[PDB]
Amino acid sequence: RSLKKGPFIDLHLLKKVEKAVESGDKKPLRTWSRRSTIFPNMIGLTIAVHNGRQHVPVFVTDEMVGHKLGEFAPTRTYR
Amino acid sequence: AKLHDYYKDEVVKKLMTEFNYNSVMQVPRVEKITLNMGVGEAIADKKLLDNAAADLAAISGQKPLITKARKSVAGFKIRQGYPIGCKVTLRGERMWEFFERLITIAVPRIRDFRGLSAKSFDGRGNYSMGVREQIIFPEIDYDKVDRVRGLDITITTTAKSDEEGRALLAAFDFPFRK
């Protein structure tokens, strides 16, 4: 849905990803950015996405190839 | 020709020559296969007899059985039994002809089987086939009736086929050549 000439990765997200794959397995850390593009090369992170008053963990799996990090965090609360 | 296939192949050369097994009366034999229809409480339909008598009288000139109830027990107000189905159990040469025409419609053209057709699982020896898709019709009008070959066709099978099943013959869906 975005441009096919360039994906959008935050620099702070990229340095968190590089430090996390330097460390290896790691407990989830709270990330505030929902504007992100993931890749099959970096599938495996346990990074958590913030949506307002509650923070939810996200465990990415093999089938997501281009989705946002904010899609798995529900911003709205319904009954 | 499938009767000649059963008489000819898988039996007479190698197991007769090298390592003897006991009886061609002991090897499984295809008995009379059957087909049934399942219509509702309406009596006014003639379409059931039309399709079953068409599949019978494309070669023959006879009519199916109009079955009311084997059980003769009804949960409705009339316990006696309304005529609510058709039966054609296939017979000898015509049985082998119907089995061969079912194979030569379903098998050599990949049309019907999309995914894994086996979903309801239990063990004891039943193969009923309901296509729900009109596979063949003898008249020039291919599909004008309300029924879409929703009828069940019963084959009785000890579904194991162990020796040459798990050796070479599984089932699945890659048409190959020599």
Partner: protein
């Protein structure tokens, strides 16, 4: 005659017949007829068997009906395996593209229930 369907597309035009087949619309039907060499103004009724065979090959060289339908089905199932916003709106029966649900969500909602 008929290729893989419930009702006869004949006594009509070839583009109308290849829209009545599932999974091919008007523009891809015109592409199928252009790659098969069959004119559009002729009728699919009273068509020769070889031209129907070339039309069958043209339909078969692209994605057929049923296979594209189950492809849509596992795409929606993969979205539900994600559990993302699109999968949640698919489960709730709410619109996915992002239009309003205060009024005028009645296509996704179906008939109005009090």
């Amino acid at each position: 005659a008929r290729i893989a369907g419930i009702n006869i597309p004949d006594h009509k035009h070839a583009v109308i017949a290849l829209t009545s087949i599932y999974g091919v619309g008007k523009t891809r039907s015109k592409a199928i007829l252009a790659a098969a060499g069959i004119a559009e103004d002729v009728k699919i009724s009273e068509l020769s068997e070889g031209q129907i065979d070339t039309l069958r090959d043209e339909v078969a060289k692209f994605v057929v009906e049923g296979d594209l339908r189950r492809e849509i089905s596992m795409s929606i199932k993969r979205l539900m395996d994600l559990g993302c916003y699109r999968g949640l709106r698919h489960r709730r029966g709410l619109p996915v593209r992002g239009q309003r649900t205060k009024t005028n969500a009645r296509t996704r909602k179906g008939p109005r229930k009090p």
